Each structure stands twice: as C-alpha cells, then as structure tokens.
C-alpha cells in the first residue's frame, strides 16, 4: 500500500473566495505523475489536472495546481458555483495506483 491523503475533507466557500485543497504522498514520488480528478454528483471522475500543473481540456484557467515532493495542492482563484464538486488526487508512479480520500467543496 502507497498512500495519498487530503487536507481537508469538507470545505465551505463564499462565491469569490480562494480555495486550496492539498494532497500528499506517503513516499516521495514525482510531481509529474500526480493527476487530479473532479467528480460532480450524479456522474464520473472528470480528469481535471494532469502533470502537477497541467490543466485538462476545458478546465477553467482560474484553477491552479503545484507541488514537488510529498505535498501537492490545488487552488481555485475565485471560487464560483460550478466548482462545487468533490475533487480527488491520484498516483500513477508505481503500482498500485492509489487515490486520495477526495476533498468535498461546496458553495456558501
């Protein structure tokens, strides 16, 4: 077992705020194999961030990813109402590929 965990579990954001959910490995893997997924109730994991800083096709550019070492974070410039998903991180470094407990955002 290889472990990522997300600080924190549930958030609460006023529209227009700046959010940052962190993610963190158990053993030092490398930035460039930590993908970030976004899942909106009633549907399937939607590839959000690839690399540690690459956004996927469509991800609004108010979103930001960064890290190196054991702590990777995600940050949203101006929280808006369609960011209300549950985000999760993922490790494609060494098998097995493991995932975060997933942080749940919600809009105030």
């Amino acid at each position: 077992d290889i472990q990522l965990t997300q600080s924190p579990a549930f958030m609460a954001a006023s529209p227009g705020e700046k959010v940052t959910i962190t993610c963190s490995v158990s053993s030092s893997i490398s930035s460039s194999n930590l993908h970030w997924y976004q899942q909106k109730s009633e549907t399937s994991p939607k590839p959000w961030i690839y690399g540690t800083s690459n956004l996927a096709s469509g991800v609004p550019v108010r979103f930001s990813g960064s890290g190196s070492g054991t702590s990777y974070s995600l940050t949203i410039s101006s929280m808006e109402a369609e960011d209300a998903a549950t985000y999760y991180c993922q490790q494609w470094n060494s098998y097995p590929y493991t995932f975060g407990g997933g942080t749940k955002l919600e809009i105030k």
Partner: protein, 122 residues
Amino acid sequence: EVKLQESGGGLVQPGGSMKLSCVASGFTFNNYWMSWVRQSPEKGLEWVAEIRLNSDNFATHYAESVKGKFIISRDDSKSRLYLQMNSLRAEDTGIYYCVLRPLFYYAVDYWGQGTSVTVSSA
C-alpha cells in the same frame, strides 16, 4: 479525442461471473495502457486492473484484492477491452470506469462513464 463506451453491467448471485467491456474509438494509438478503476460508497475509487501495451503484446498487473479473481484482456484487432471477473463478492459491487491513457510524452488519459455491478444474493 475519444469515445469509450462500456457495456455488460448488471447484478449476479455472489460467486457469479461477468465480462465488462468497453470499445475504443478514435484511438489507434500505436502505444497506450488501459485499466479498470471502480467506485462504491464503501471504498471511494480504486485502481482494480490494467493490461499494458507499450508494444510488448500483453503485460498485466492487479492488486491486493482482485488478483486470482479477474483478468484484463483486450485485443486491438477487436478494438475492445474485456474484463472478466470471477468468484465475486459483496465487496466488489460498484461502478467500473474504463480509462485509457496513451504514452505520448504528455497529454492526459481519458475516462468513460461506467455501469453498475451488483453482487447480491437476492
């Protein structure tokens, strides 16, 4: 670019066998990898299996509690990616996502939408 549609879901008396599927469209991506991830409320998401095509025909890899039980298989000629699961239990109930990523230096993987599998005695 992509179009992944997985078929085959349902419900099986425990012990029952199955064969999820999903067929690739758009791809003929010389070199990819594909795998099945699954999500139930009990466990959140979990990488279950993964066949692998860097160019060696088949190399597979499974995990803590799936090996022995399922076997990834897929043939490009067929365009499809089959996933037979045997000796099923409660634990294994969930939605199976079928995600394929290509080994370009960079881009991102793709995902499809899933199907429920329900292991119940009822």
